[PDB]
Amino acid sequence: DLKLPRQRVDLVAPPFVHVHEQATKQGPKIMEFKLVVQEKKMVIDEKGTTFQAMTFNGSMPGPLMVVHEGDYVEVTLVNPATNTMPHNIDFHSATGALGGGALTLINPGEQVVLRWKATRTGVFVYHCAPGGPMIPWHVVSGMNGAVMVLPRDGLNDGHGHSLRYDRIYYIGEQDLYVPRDEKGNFKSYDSPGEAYSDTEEVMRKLTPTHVVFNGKAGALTGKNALNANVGENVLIVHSQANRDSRPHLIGGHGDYVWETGKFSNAPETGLETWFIRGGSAGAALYKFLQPGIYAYVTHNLIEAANLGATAHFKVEGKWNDDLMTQVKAPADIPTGSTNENLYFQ
Template sequence: MMTRRETLLGAALTSLVLTAPAFAAAADDIGKLPRQKIDLVAPPFVHAHQQATKEGPKVIEFKMVIQEKEVVIDDDGTKFQAMTFNGSMPGPLMVVHQNDYVELTLVNPASNTMPHNIDFHASTGALGGGALTLINPGEQVVLRFKADRTGVFVYHCAPGGNMIPWHVVSGMNGAIMVLPREGLKDRDGKPLHYDRVYYIGEQDMYVPKDESGKYKTYGSPAESYTDTVEVMRKLIPTHEVFNGRVGALTGKNAMTAKVGETVLIVHSQANRDTRPHLIGGHGDYVWETGKFSNPPETNLETWFIRGGSAGAALYTFKQPGVYAYVNHNLIEAVELGATAHFKVDGTWNDDLMKQVSAPGPIPNAPSN
């Protein structure tokens, strides 16, 4: 009997054989394109890139190594068996331009215990690449696809069946940004520019507890599977976090900016709906559905990111201070961990806000 992997790969290979002449012609054309190798960086940071380009399409080479590892996800020391792209939750943000070719080398080291693959929501065909990238420990694969539509898109592991949600909520998700070649624009076609870009990946986690209510620990992802699935099926996360753990983007790890700088915030959630909100700020321009071919909405207080998608928002900071960036389901923000901070340097503008009088006793208040 054929395994599921053999069935998937067999169907994909049949498709490739049936269209071999077209693929050969395309390969010849792609072979003439310039190639650029990009070293990915861990979120919330993003690798260097041009916002607009007059150059023609390229083949952009990326490499990601799948890491299965134990991580700590809160200040109480809760341990979690994570599965990750490149060791981070979320995986790195990839940036290309429309009509570039993404060429990813995906590596599953022999030290891992599980098969993995990758499904790009930005790609077309073969289960988003999932049917062509399923690899066992000790294997690697190279996938190439054309980034033919602009926007920010989720990618995630999708090895099949009930393995799919388990791998996704164990950390195997990230995003890719496909910029228009001419750069971002407002609804009137005016160019938009950002001084900094940060990538926030929101993650729901489902950590089993023992009979006494304490979080359980496991020696490997496979060992945690049965208990974790039981928690997952109740659809109530134990943690809802940004970038892999409670407080990952607060305190000394807060994202930084200066008054007058415009920041692009890319926000993804591969599994659950979320509602980003910048306390004390706004979304000057927001691609709520994450697709740059659609005009951005303006001046949003809170925006909606559908589960399984990514969105993008531009904001120019006007006041210094610490801004909380939260999931405005405030229960998830405060109780479960979905809070980040921006630390902004600059000079305060009294015209925008001023404390007219300091806290003090109520004048002429009757005494008790």
């Protein structure tokens, strides 16, 4: 009895996002998405450590889904008979039934269809939540993604001026808890079930062994650096389903930041580092002003450099010597300089 145009959306693998319009004059639609659970071993660091992962659509994070305020979202969740455990899905964007968790529990070999109305604008987390201690275990094993619900008029700056992005990326950050053997080496398992008890012991101490973007250390570095151009307005959506994060664009700023991730609230301007609370998504706009390599990190630098949480942007364009310049290149300290006279010696 819900009589609205339907539209099928094909999701893509993060950090890219499926095609969508920002501002729209189209009325409300039923937007149809399909997610298939996949349990599999994945590599999570540059030394080749492996991990028994559980994913939506084979990726960590799950794909970003984009709809407009007032749309209805109809999700088919599929749990193929190759999987070993029950799974479900809960959307933080949705209202009732534990975000839909209470309506979507499916055994291997089954599927379910849930519909929810997109009544609140912003970016939101979605994750598996089977019940009890299964909940943290599914989420930290990789079963979490995000949804963005745009206002029909697109983003604005909270002072009645429109904001438009040229480019969008979705960075999902994941905390992982990998057991070690007596000698400190990471342990390997043949199934998720088998990893469980040792993993639980690591989770209980609340300290991750890895903190990764897009599912592995180095995933968004080297040849998979993110691309941009001087002058472009880039939206970066950042989610963390379980633990806090402090995103920082090294060499840049957050021009407009919705750190709690909800478009009904005016963004903050000109931030250096912002804060994603565990269990939420945030979004930041930035207009690149200078070419070159930028590092996008969590600004716990131990986690960024040593546990895996660094992505790269490669930005093409012309350098602006007004903003920054090397006045004098590295040179010998002058013989006639007197730094030994300074207050602190």
